[PDB]
Structure 1
């Protein structure tokens, strides 16, 4: 999943952001790693629909 995330951004080296995206963009891995914080990982881009004009 990390490699798939990396290829999706035209990169050849897996970075912690890619691990974050791969883990959080999966149904079961997120459940498995719900209480784990990844350094230099960031969050998922999302905006609530009641804030966009």
Structure 2
């Protein structure tokens, strides 16, 4: 999944952010790693509807 996220960013090498994106987007990995922080992971882009114009 990370390897996919990296191909999706025209990068040869997996970086943290890739591992995060992979995990937080897969229902089951997210749930397994529910209380885990991934160093240099960032968060999934997500802006609550009511906040948009």
- TM bucket normalised to smaller: over 0.9
What is the TM-score when the length of structure 2 is the normalising length? 0.96
Name the structure where helix makes up a greater proportion of residues: 2
Q: What are the ranges of 5 or more consecutive residues in structure 2 without an aligned counterpart?
A: none
Aligned residue pair count: 53
Measured after TM superposition, the shift of residue 9 of structure 1 is 0.7
Measured after TM superposition, the shift of residue 30 of structure 1 is 0.4
Measured after TM superposition, the shift of residue 12 of structure 1 is 0.4
Q: What are the ranges of 5 or more consecutive residues in structure 1 without an aligned counterpart?
A: none
Q: How large is the Cα RMSD of the aligned pairs?
A: 0.5
* Runs of 4+ deviating beyond 6 Å: none
